Design a protein around this motif. Structure first.
Motif, PDB file in Angstrom:
ATOM      1  N   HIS A   1      -0.583 -10.695  12.555  1.00 59.66           N
ATOM      2  CA  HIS A   1       0.701 -10.558  13.222  1.00 59.66           C
ATOM      3  C   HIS A   1       1.137  -9.104  13.145  1.00 59.66           C
ATOM      4  CE1 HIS A   1       4.955 -11.281  14.321  1.00 59.66           C
ATOM      5  NE2 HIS A   1       4.480 -12.369  14.899  1.00 59.66           N
ATOM      6  N   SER A   2       2.006  -8.715  14.071  1.00 62.16           N
ATOM      7  CA  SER A   2       2.671  -7.429  13.965  1.00 62.16           C
ATOM      8  C   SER A   2       3.858  -7.532  13.010  1.00 62.16           C
ATOM      9  CB  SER A   2       3.127  -6.942  15.338  1.00 62.16           C
ATOM     10  OG  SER A   2       3.911  -7.923  15.991  1.00 62.16           O
ATOM     11  N   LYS A   3       4.309  -6.369  12.535  1.00 64.63           N
ATOM     12  CA  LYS A   3       5.427  -6.165  11.613  1.00 64.63           C
ATOM     13  C   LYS A   3       5.189  -6.750  10.224  1.00 64.63           C
ATOM     14  CE  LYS A   3       6.916  -4.290  15.094  1.00 64.63           C
ATOM     15  NZ  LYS A   3       5.638  -4.756  15.693  1.00 64.63           N
ATOM     16  N   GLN A   4       4.039  -7.373   9.972  1.00 64.02           N
ATOM     17  CA  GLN A   4       3.715  -7.982   8.689  1.00 64.02           C
ATOM     18  C   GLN A   4       2.230  -8.304   8.672  1.00 64.02           C
ATOM     19  OE1 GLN A   4       5.162  -8.091   5.864  1.00 64.02           O
ATOM     20  NE2 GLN A   4       5.415 -10.132   4.975  1.00 64.02           N
ATOM     21  N   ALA A   5       1.604  -8.148   7.509  1.00 66.71           N
ATOM     22  CA  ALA A   5       0.193  -8.451   7.344  1.00 66.71           C
ATOM     23  C   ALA A   5      -0.012  -9.293   6.094  1.00 66.71           C
ATOM     24  CB  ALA A   5      -0.652  -7.173   7.261  1.00 66.71           C
ATOM     25  N   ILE A   6      -1.106 -10.050   6.100  1.00 61.97           N
ATOM     26  CA  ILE A   6      -1.475 -10.925   4.994  1.00 61.97           C
ATOM     27  C   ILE A   6      -2.981 -10.817   4.759  1.00 61.97           C
ATOM     28  CG2 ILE A   6      -1.488 -13.023   6.530  1.00 61.97           C
ATOM     29  CD1 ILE A   6      -0.207 -12.783   2.866  1.00 61.97           C
TER      30      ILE A   6
ATOM     31  N   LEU B   1       0.804  -1.218   0.000  1.00 61.92           N
ATOM     32  CA  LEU B   1       0.000   0.000   0.000  1.00 61.92           C
ATOM     33  C   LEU B   1       0.839   1.270   0.000  1.00 61.92           C
ATOM     34  CD1 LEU B   1      -3.166   0.221   0.049  1.00 61.92           C
ATOM     35  CD2 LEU B   1      -2.329  -2.048   0.619  1.00 61.92           C
ATOM     36  N   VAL B   2       2.158   1.163   0.121  1.00 63.77           N
ATOM     37  CA  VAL B   2       3.044   2.302  -0.076  1.00 63.77           C
ATOM     38  C   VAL B   2       3.838   2.183  -1.375  1.00 63.77           C
ATOM     39  CG1 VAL B   2       4.853   1.265   1.319  1.00 63.77           C
ATOM     40  CG2 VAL B   2       4.843   3.741   1.035  1.00 63.77           C
ATOM     41  N   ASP B   3       4.030   0.973  -1.898  1.00 66.38           N
ATOM     42  CA  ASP B   3       4.752   0.804  -3.152  1.00 66.38           C
ATOM     43  C   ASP B   3       3.867   1.152  -4.344  1.00 66.38           C
ATOM     44  OD1 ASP B   3       7.438   0.084  -2.569  1.00 66.38           O
ATOM     45  OD2 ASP B   3       6.772  -1.895  -1.903  1.00 66.38           O
ATOM     46  N   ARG B   4       2.732   0.459  -4.479  1.00 71.49           N
ATOM     47  CA  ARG B   4       1.788   0.768  -5.549  1.00 71.49           C
ATOM     48  C   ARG B   4       1.219   2.175  -5.401  1.00 71.49           C
ATOM     49  NH1 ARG B   4      -0.053  -4.151  -7.476  1.00 71.49           N
ATOM     50  NH2 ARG B   4      -0.907  -3.088  -9.314  1.00 71.49           N
TER      51      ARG B   4
ATOM     52  N   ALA C   1      15.517  -6.535   0.922  1.00 78.09           N
ATOM     53  CA  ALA C   1      14.807  -5.989   2.072  1.00 78.09           C
ATOM     54  C   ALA C   1      15.648  -4.997   2.862  1.00 78.09           C
ATOM     55  CB  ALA C   1      14.351  -7.121   2.992  1.00 78.09           C
ATOM     56  N   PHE C   2      16.967  -5.032   2.707  1.00 77.90           N
ATOM     57  CA  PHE C   2      17.840  -4.098   3.407  1.00 77.90           C
ATOM     58  C   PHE C   2      17.664  -2.690   2.851  1.00 77.90           C
ATOM     59  CE2 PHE C   2      21.954  -1.912   3.724  1.00 77.90           C
ATOM     60  CZ  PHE C   2      22.149  -1.946   5.088  1.00 77.90           C
ATOM     61  N   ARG C   3      17.465  -1.723   3.754  1.00 77.62           N
ATOM     62  CA  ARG C   3      17.239  -0.311   3.420  1.00 77.62           C
ATOM     63  C   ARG C   3      16.011  -0.121   2.534  1.00 77.62           C
ATOM     64  NH1 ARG C   3      23.063   1.299   1.600  1.00 77.62           N
ATOM     65  NH2 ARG C   3      24.211   1.090   3.568  1.00 77.62           N
ATOM     66  N   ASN C   4      15.021  -0.999   2.666  1.00 72.82           N
ATOM     67  CA  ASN C   4      13.822  -0.924   1.851  1.00 72.82           C
ATOM     68  C   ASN C   4      12.594  -1.121   2.725  1.00 72.82           C
ATOM     69  OD1 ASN C   4      14.219  -0.462  -1.085  1.00 72.82           O
ATOM     70  ND2 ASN C   4      15.565  -2.250  -0.926  1.00 72.82           N
ATOM     71  N   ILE C   5      11.492  -0.496   2.304  1.00 74.83           N
ATOM     72  CA  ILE C   5      10.216  -0.645   2.998  1.00 74.83           C
ATOM     73  C   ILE C   5       9.730  -2.087   2.931  1.00 74.83           C
ATOM     74  CG2 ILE C   5       9.095   0.203   0.897  1.00 74.83           C
ATOM     75  CD1 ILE C   5       7.811   0.489   4.541  1.00 74.83           C
ATOM     76  N   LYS C   6      10.090  -2.808   1.868  1.00 75.82           N
ATOM     77  CA  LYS C   6       9.680  -4.197   1.713  1.00 75.82           C
ATOM     78  C   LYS C   6      10.236  -5.055   2.841  1.00 75.82           C
ATOM     79  CE  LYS C   6       9.183  -4.363  -3.326  1.00 75.82           C
ATOM     80  NZ  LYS C   6       7.734  -4.044  -3.245  1.00 75.82           N
ATOM     81  N   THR C   7       9.362  -5.846   3.452  1.00 76.60           N
ATOM     82  CA  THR C   7       9.775  -6.738   4.520  1.00 76.60           C
ATOM     83  C   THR C   7      10.504  -7.949   3.948  1.00 76.60           C
ATOM     84  OG1 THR C   7       7.854  -8.201   4.644  1.00 76.60           O
ATOM     85  CG2 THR C   7       7.651  -6.000   5.613  1.00 76.60           C
ATOM     86  N   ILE C   8      11.280  -8.605   4.814  1.00 79.79           N
ATOM     87  CA  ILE C   8      12.083  -9.752   4.395  1.00 79.79           C
ATOM     88  C   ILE C   8      11.200 -10.907   3.935  1.00 79.79           C
ATOM     89  CG2 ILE C   8      12.297 -10.481   6.818  1.00 79.79           C
ATOM     90  CD1 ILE C   8      14.920 -10.936   3.995  1.00 79.79           C
TER      91      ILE C   8
END
Ligand SMILES: [Mg+2]
Ligand SMILES: [Mg+2]
Ligand SMILES: [Mg+2]
Ligand SMILES: [Mg+2]
Ligand SMILES: [Mg+2]
Ligand SMILES: [Mg+2]
Ligand SMILES: [Mg+2]
Ligand SMILES: [Mg+2]
Lengths: 69, 145, 63, 107, 67, 141, 80, 206, 141
Positions: free
Chosen positions: A59-64, A29-32, H164-171
């Motif tokens: 979960h925190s830190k990640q969503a699906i 939702l921030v990339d697109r 994922a390093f230095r990126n908004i994208k999670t690992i």
RNA sequence: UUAAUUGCGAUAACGAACGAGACCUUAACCUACUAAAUAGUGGUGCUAGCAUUUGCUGGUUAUCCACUUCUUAGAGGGACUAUCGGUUUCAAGCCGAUGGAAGUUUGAGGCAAUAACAGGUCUGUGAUGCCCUUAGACGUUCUGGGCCGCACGCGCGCUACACUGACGGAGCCAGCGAGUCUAACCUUGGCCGAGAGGUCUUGGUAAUCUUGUGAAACUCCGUCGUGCUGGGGAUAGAGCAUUGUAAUUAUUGCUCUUCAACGAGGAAUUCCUAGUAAGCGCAAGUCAUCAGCUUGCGUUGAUUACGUCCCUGCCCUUUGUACACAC
């Protein structure tokens, strides 16, 4: 650089594009889009309570999140 | 614990205390750009002003921008226990002064210029710009100060 | 490219300057009785099926 | 004195474990022959005293380190004994190098 | 790194030399035999001596062993 | 349907008990809450300023229930953490003494805990009764 | 007084005690006995006393500014 | 299948796992045959485990780590760059999110997707330095299946790590897109490009 | 008398003691249900001693586990072994050998650490190095 | 062939000795013996609280009984590559599979031969030769400073450059230690104080009490959202405390405040093969106070390889030597 504040001319960008998204999360939702990460988390939790998108694991830190039915 | 939707009555960049303060970021961490205001002080000032911390420093109103400055320049009157301030028990008048944006450098300049006139060691080292807290200068600080 | 398969049937010995290369005797899964010798880099045993992009090549660094 | 229990506690400690074992076996031995009610010899964890020192007296050389170990083994036995019987066996024939403590509890 | 030294080997050969009828093809009873037909100053050395003795006997049954 | 506060999820129970005391409105917050970092090993005030004391009270009340008796010092080490000492490595230092003392005194006034002359404070009769009620409503809702 | 009392006793088989031998190995040189003769006397006495082996080392400067070590051994010895 | 009652309550979703030993709760290793040959008996299947956390012993024999399950091996390579050494519970959380992303995309099994990505990633041939000095040549060699699956996991994990390093994208997100691109074969992932780079250096230094 | 067996399971420093008695399927560790074990990422680390031989084998079994030592995941590995060992020990003393062997075969065929302790042990650190094998950095210059 | 001058063999050598190994300490197992109110468990003479028809929890061992599974420590038992298969000159051996607590010399150390080094230490010694000094002392003591001084170069390190994260709350699990009457050692509990810390007391000369050292990394739930940014904490200012006779050249701790370099590091270079690397803390050492250091301990726990002589170093054989203070 990012739309940290949502308005009407940005609101239609979410509500018309969140259908057909197989994957929905804070990073897509921030990339697109252009909205910031904090408001993206707001958008995801907002769009769950009405029920246009479905949860797979909370979960925190990640969503699906995916579509309905 | 719940989160409510909000609408964008956003405003442009803003100026407080003769210092540029950007918007687009939360109010507590926006006042941190003011010299002499840190994370702890700006967090206290906001909660004393009784404002929402999720207000992004750009969608507030003039009434609560006037409110935060008054608390910031007058700490004690707004329930600040005087151990939270920048300069405590002032060497001149014995008052507790929290120093602000344009006055931090000037007060610091006055304090160092005091010790130079005094010829005190902590100011003597400042005159050459050396280390003033007794840290070893054997193999360290070979770029500045 | 139609890469062919091959099954290792004998570990001849360890070769290479630093010893990281192993030399094996290997036959062909398709067109059996075609048995050749190669130079393998990774850890290998018997019956290890590996793919050769070219078959007309025999090991040169040996003994 | 007329056959009255004392509720004695005998505690044994020394570095030389082997002969302390014999006396701990000795103290338990002279109880059943006199029909003495008892609580058995309770063995306590060994306290490994450790010293980590440099081998070298000076500073030169590779930094080699030694660990010395002064092991100490502590045991204790609770004996329901008469006043007479304990005194003429514990005030006599005391083993060398082993420390013994005779204390009284009356809970 | 499990190559038996001369102390194990020479004691095993000397044991088979004079005690072949008493011995068997089982280390579990071979180790018991060692304590009561020889003097070994530790249990680990006895197990080594008796273990190579059983390995020697397994070789003796199928063909002779020189020495 | 026998229930104690051990069958309920740990994270959820502090959330439920803090909300209950938030709705109860009788915990007599010491008023220096919203300004204290609640540990010398911390660097920022608690994000949920209005309700952090109620969650801290819920955590403390749960810990007196599951243990025998807990004093102030054990609570200071309990909620302490690693303090970023800057250039020097991390270290463990205890939590705030005053807050951990006054949360016990707050629960003393409500009667969640007793005096417990054998040490610190032990759980009280009426204290563990309401804990089991919130434990019962969480698993049965 | 009386709580601690000495008990002097004699020592059997002096030749099987290095501390007693090394002391006597020292006083002989202080009496002017030759270094080799004193060292050979000690090892011979230790061996005739019933020891499986002996080892005498004399280190230091003798008859020269340079120091050197002398080893006088007999019989069987271990080290590890 | 049929429910059972105990003094302690037990959820239904976990109560159904007795008939079929799957992964966490969702993906089953049945019908996940490695359609690419020459890598079986080096990618482990048909012996399922619920979770990819296992304190097994795989570094005492030469080939014992092949018998180690495939999902376990992938998690072991996410514990890299020093700051993440140890911290295996963090890496198990990452893959569970990673397979969930593969399931909201890519309707086929994520276990098959990662298996099919391993086969398409391992460099079938490589190159070794031959020569006694620095200014030496290079000689082409073929790769054993064990090194191929080892290099297949390494090519995915490092390239999904620096993304994922230095990126908004999670690992978990970078790994998920790295796995699906490598499964299909897109040449836009770090793993596929490196395999072609290594394989064409071998075709040159032959 | 109550028919009970007492067993244990050991990870590196974590040891869980398991009391296995007749009853109706109570599975409690530290007075907390097996559905409450933490962290939840490793719920399925103690579920397979129940989920592989079948939950129907707990219709007359009560398991009480108390654990100390080790760490967060050493304890869950110690807990999962004590329950599996306790089930076999109970089935060895009161159940026929066929049923105990089928448990023994199933646990062995899935993971030997359900019944056999991890023989890996910590190794002594050496002088001149931070760890057992690792050494300090030399320079030559 | 082995880790091994370890052995199998060859054989003008034969039988030996030291070293290596064996040995010792420690880790892994023991539902087998001895036992335990300083360890733990279960019923209960005594029972109690909550919720209900029994789960969780708090106390008494002439306000109880029984035991050793877990803990402890004594005696011991146990592994010897056991069994099988393959290979080897069918020898020493090696490899794989099975079983087993353990099949890397079962892991790790203690000790460690001959011959040496112009290696280090006279600044450990009331160990010492010689020389120097010895009353205006190069003896000793006291006051204050210096060893920390800063254009620069090099080595061992700590914290980072971030999202696999920072911060907030919550969940919350170790082991090796040490510790006072020869007076302040470890400090629990109560109170005060933001905090540091102050104060009233309690226990422990210690499997008893500090201390279940409720350690950190970690886990969850949230705030942040790729921004030298809420990364990072260097520098610098004000104040509040502790230790010390004494803190200035800031011992250190805490509060507020400035938020510097640094965007993964050139040439080059270190360590490491399984509970190992690495991360993470804890204890002890020094210690009035101060660890970023060391010695140990535990927590989380990889990748890769089971090899070779390519570099480096060492050893051996052959060879050459005008070298032997030995290139
Ligand atoms: Mg010997
Ligand atoms: Mg030899
Ligand atoms: Mg100096
Ligand atoms: Mg403990
Ligand atoms: Mg920061
Ligand atoms: Mg900044
Ligand atoms: Mg030092
Ligand atoms: Mg020549």
């Amino acid at each position: 650089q990012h739309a940290v504040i949502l308005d009407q001319e940005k609101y239609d960008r979410i509500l018309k594009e969140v259908p057909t998204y197989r994957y929905v999360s804070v990073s897509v939702l921030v990339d697109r889009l252009k909205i910031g990460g904090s408001l993206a988390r707001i958008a995801l939790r907002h769009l769950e309570k009405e029920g246009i998108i479905k949860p797979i694991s909370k979960h925190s830190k990640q969503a699906i999140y995916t579509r309905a039915t | 614990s719940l989160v409510v939707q909000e609408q964008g009555s956003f405003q442009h960049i803003l100026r407080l205390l003769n210092t540029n303060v950007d918007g687009n970021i939360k109010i507590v961490y926006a006042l941190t750009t003011i010299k002499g205001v840190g994370r702890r002080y700006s967090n206290l000032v906001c909660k004393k002003a009784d404002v929402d911390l999720h207000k992004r420093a750009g969608e507030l109103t003039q009434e609560e921008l006037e409110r935060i400055v008054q608390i910031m320049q007058n700490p004690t009157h707004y329930k600040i226990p005087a151990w939270f301030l920048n300069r405590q028990n002032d060497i001149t008048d014995g008052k507790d002064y929290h120093t602000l944006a344009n006055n931090v450098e000037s007060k610091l300049r006055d304090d160092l210029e005091r010790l130079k006139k005094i010829r005190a060691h902590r100011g003597i080292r400042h005159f050459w710009g050396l280390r003033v807290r007794g840290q070893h200068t054997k193999t360290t600080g070979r770029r500045r100060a | 490219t139609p890469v062919t398969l091959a099954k290792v049937i004998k570990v001849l010995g360890r070769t290479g300057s630093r010893g990281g290369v192993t030399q094996v005797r290997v036959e062909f899964l398709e067109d059996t009785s075609r048995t050749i010798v190669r130079n393998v880099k990774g850890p290998v045993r018997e019956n290890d099926i590996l793919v050769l992009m070219e078959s007309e090549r025999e090991a040169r660094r040996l003994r | 004195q007329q056959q009255q229990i004392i509720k004695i506690r005998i505690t044994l400690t020394s570095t030389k474990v082997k002969q302390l074992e014999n006396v701990s076996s000795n103290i338990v031995k002279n109880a059943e022959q006199h029909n003495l009610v008892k609580k058995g010899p309770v063995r306590l964890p060994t306290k490994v005293l450790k010293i980590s020192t440099r081998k070298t007296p000076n500073g030169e050389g590779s930094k080699t380190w030694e660990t010395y170990e002064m092991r100490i083994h502590k045991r204790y036995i609770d004996l329901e004994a008469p006043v007479q019987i304990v005194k003429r066996i514990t005030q006599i024939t005391i083993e060398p190098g082993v420390d013994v403590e005779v204390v009284v509890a009356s809970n | 790194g499990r190559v038996r030294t001369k102390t194990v080997k020479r004691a095993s050969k000397a044991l088979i030399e004079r005690y072949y009828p008493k011995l068997t093809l089982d280390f579990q009873t071979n180790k018991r035999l060692c304590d009561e037909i020889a003097t070994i100053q530790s249990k680990r050395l006895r197990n080594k001596i008796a273990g190579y003795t059983t390995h020697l006997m397994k070789r003796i049954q199928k063909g002779p062993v020189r020495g | 349907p026998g229930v104690s506060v051990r069958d309920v999820a740990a994270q959820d129970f502090i959330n439920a008990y803090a909300s209950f005391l938030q709705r109860q409105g009788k915990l007599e917050v010491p008023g220096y809450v919203d300004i204290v970092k609640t540990s010398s090993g911390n660097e920022m005030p608690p994000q949920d300023a209005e309700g952090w004391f109620y969650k801290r009270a819920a955590s403390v009340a749960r810990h007196i229930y599951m243990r025998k008796q807990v004093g102030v010092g054990k609570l200071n080490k309990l909620y302490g953490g690693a303090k970023s000492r800057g250039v020097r490595p991390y270290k463990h230092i205890d939590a705030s003494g005053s807050i951990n003392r006054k949360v016990l005194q707050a629960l003393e006034k409500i009667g969640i805990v007793e005096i417990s002359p054998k040490g610190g404070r032990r759980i009280s009769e009426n204290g563990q009764r309401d804990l089991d009620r919130i434990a019962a409503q969480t698993l049965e809702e | 007084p009386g709580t601690i009392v000495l008990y002097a006793e004699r020592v059997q088989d002096r030749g099987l005690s290095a501390v007693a031998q090394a002391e006597s190995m020292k006083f002989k040189l202080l009496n002017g006995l030759a270094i080799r003769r004193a060292a050979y006397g000690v090892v011979r006495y230790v061996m005739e006393s019933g020891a499986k082996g002996c080892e005498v080392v004399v280190s230091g400067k003798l008859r020269a500014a340079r120091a050197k070590a002398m080893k006088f051994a007999d019989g069987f010895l271990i080290h590890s | 299948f049929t429910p059972v009652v105990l003094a302690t309550p037990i959820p239904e979703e976990v109560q159904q796992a007795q008939t079929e030993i799957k992964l966490f709760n969702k993906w089953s290793f049945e019908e996940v045959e490695v359609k690419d040959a020459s890598l079986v008996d080096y990618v482990q299947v048909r012996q399922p485990i619920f979770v990819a956390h296992t304190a097994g012993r795989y570094a005492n024999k030469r080939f014992r780590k092949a018998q180690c399950p495939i999902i376990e091996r992938l998690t072991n390579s996410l514990m890299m760059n020093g700051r993440n050494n140890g911290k295996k519970l963090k890496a198990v959380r990452i893959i569970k999110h990673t397979l969930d992303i593969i399931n909201v995309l890519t309707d086929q099994n994520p276990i098959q997707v990662v298996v099919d990505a391993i086969t398409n990633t391992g460099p079938r041939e490589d190159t070794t330095r031959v020569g006694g000095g620095g200014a030496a040549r290079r000689q082409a060699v073929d790769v054993s299946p064990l090194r191929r699956v080892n290099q297949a996991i390494a090519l995915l994990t490092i390239g999904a790590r620096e993304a994922a390093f230095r990126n908004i994208k999670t690992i978990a997100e970078t790994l998920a897109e790295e796995l699906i691109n490598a499964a299909k074969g897109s040449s836009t992932s770090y793993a596929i490009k490196k395999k072609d780079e290594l394989e064409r250096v071998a075709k040159s230094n032959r | 008398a109550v028919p009970s067996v007492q067993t244990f399971g050991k990870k590196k420093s974590a040891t869980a003691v398991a009391h296995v008695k007749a009853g109706k399927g109570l599975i409690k560790v530290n007075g907390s249900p097996i559905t409450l074990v933490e962290p939840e990422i490793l719920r399925f680390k103690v579920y397979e001693p129940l989920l592989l031989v079948g939950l129907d084998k707990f219709s007359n079994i009560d398991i009480r586990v108390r654990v100390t030592g080790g760490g967060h995941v050493s304890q869950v590995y110690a807990i999962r072994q004590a329950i599996a060992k306790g089930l076999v020990a109970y089935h060895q003393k009161y159940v026929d050998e066929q049923s105990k062997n089928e448990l023994k075969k199933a646990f062995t065929s899935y993971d030997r650490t359900l019944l056999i302790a991890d023989s890996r042990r910590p190794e002594p650190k050496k002088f001149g190095g931070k760890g057992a094998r690792s050494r300090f950095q030399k320079s030559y210059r």
